[PDB]
Design a protein around this ligand. Structure first.
Ligand SMILES: *[C@@H]1O[C@H](CO)[C@@H](O[C@@H]2O[C@H](CO)[C@@H](O)[C@H](O)[C@H]2NC(C)=O)[C@H](O)[C@H]1NC(C)=O
Ligand SMILES: [Cu+2]
Length: 223
């Protein structure tokens, strides 16, 4: 249970819910086929925002994850429970209007992923125990204009069977400036990318203990 409530650019945070469609409840979407898998949604309620953050291509943004919108601290308990072990992912979608685009369907291409490392530490354990910071790279070769950043952190403490995995995600509104458009990513669709039978969704992380993890979705897009 957590929420990506605020995003940081030029080293400064843009504010709670400013440029980020946030849910009022920190509940996960468990039906990968449901339209809410893209940018959250029913049975949760997501608020709208009319702020499009101006980011210059090539630079990092950092998604701040928080146990609740009213959360004020940054301790491991203020981000998410320690049991919520799993990967952390980020996508981008080219839209005409980041302030109103739904974000459901084709157009998503992966840009960051942090699953299990050689030591066996999950990406969530670093966001939780790293003050909720989820650093993400904005490529330089994509085209400039409006975009939708979909940060995500999945928990697998009960994904032994499907339904079981817990998908937490919130989408941010961006305006990429300076992109050289020197490459066109091969995009996927949300819903459609994840499947209940994928090795990353359906998985028993304790019986037996896992050592290699397969982050769902496509490969990372690199210029
Ligand atoms: C910008 O974001 C990228 C990822 O989008 C960060 O790169 C990761 O950094 C961690 C921490 O050292 C490494 O463990 C990963 O291997 C890196 N992945 C990639 C693909 O580079 C990068 O550190 C961020 N930089 C800033 C300044 O925020
Ligand atoms: Cu939870």
């Amino acid at each position: 249970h957590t929420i990506f409530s605020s995003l940081e650019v030029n080293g400064v945070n843009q504010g709670l819910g400013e440029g980020v469609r946030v849910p009022t409840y920190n509940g996960p979407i468990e039906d990968v086929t449901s339209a809410s898998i893209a940018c959250n949604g029913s049975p949760n309620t997501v608020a709208s925002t009319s702020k499009v953050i101006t980011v210059q291509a090539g630079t990092n943004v950092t998604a701040i994850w928080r146990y609740m919108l009213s959360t004020t601290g940054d301790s491991p308990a203020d981000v998410m429970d320690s049991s919520h072990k799993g990967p952390t992912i980020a996508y981008l979608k080219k839209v005409d209007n980041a302030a109103t685009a739904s974000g459901v369907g084709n157009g998503w291409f992966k840009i960051q992923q942090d699953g299990m490392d050689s030591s066996g530490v999950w990406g969530t354990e670093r966001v939780i125990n790293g003050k909720g910071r989820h650093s993400i790279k904005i490529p330089e070769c994509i085209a400039p204009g409006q975009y939708l950043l979909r940060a995500e952190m999945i928990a697998l403490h009960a994904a032994s069977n499907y339904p079981g995995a817990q998908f937490y995600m919130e989408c941010a509104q961006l305006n990429v400036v300076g992109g050289t458009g020197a490459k066109t990513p091969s995009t996927v669709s949300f819903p459609g990318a994840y499947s209940g039978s994928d090795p990353g969704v359906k998985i028993s992380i304790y019986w037996p203990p896992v050592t290699s993890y397969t982050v769902p979705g496509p490969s990372v897009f690199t210029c």
